[PDB]
């Protein structure tokens, strides 16, 4: 519940969504030593992440992102997805699956230095933004929690929901 | 008039369904984001769920339901809703409003837990004992035409005639 701690169970998961599907393997990033907690947390969201992944109109919304130009792309998503000063774990969950696709589209261009520059970002904008909402939630644990084991669908829907509601703003303010 | 859009905007109704009227801010579901289709929808529904909260004779029976242990008695009103493989819009529309004060039941006897678990009940029975005659109603837009603007009073007795019937059935066979 040090900055520390949250700092380091978010780069671990978000490596998650990441290096789990797919690049000099001289500058590569050694994985994590993950423990008990933070397996049940990551278990989880490739749960999500394949629900995600087989949601078409947040496919359609992705699908229409700057491919290797983002920088701004992204963190206008991350503005509007929290311009309301309201947290919930799935507007978390939503900005690191954003992410990770971010990066899968930019690994199919080919551009592997931004492995690393955008996983910046997102910590970056994790501890700015969000570290604070996080550490009184008692950590990552309570997102388990947002996730009870019968109600994936469920959830998801609304999840992308908020997602593609936000891509879709970026669409059309420029 | 793909699952999914019908899925999609199944949760949106339930949903109005239900925070319309009134709990932990951090597992809360982020509103899904109304067009045009679905506001004249919801414009609608809250119109009937009045009229319908208005139905004494529907209130009492609501009111003979397990307040907290729903599970059956969820699944058992709606089998028997559609124990005759005939669909209207009517019998639709019953089904949500029974889910929606189903949750206002609980969120009195703070549960908040459930919010979920049954939104998650209803649009999968949606999925599995809906999507397809929806679907062949060319999706959701019919059930506007279910409701011409001044028959309002009217079909919502007929409405709350088979609620009413349903769960009266359920409180005799235990």
Known sequence: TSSEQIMKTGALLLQGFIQDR???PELAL???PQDASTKKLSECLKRIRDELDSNMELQRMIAAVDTDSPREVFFRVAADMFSDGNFNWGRVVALFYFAS?????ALCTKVPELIRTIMGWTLDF???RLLG???????WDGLL???GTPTWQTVTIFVAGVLTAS???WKKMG
Chains 1, 2 share one sequence.
């Open 22 to 24: 797919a690049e000099a």
């Open 30 to 32: 050694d994985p994590v």
């Open 101 to 105: 696709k971010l990066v899968l589209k």
């Open 126 to 128: 994790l501890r700015e």
């Open 133 to 139: 909402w996080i550490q009184d939630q008692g950590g």
């Open 145 to 147: 929690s947002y996730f």
């Open 167 to 169: 891509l879709t703003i």
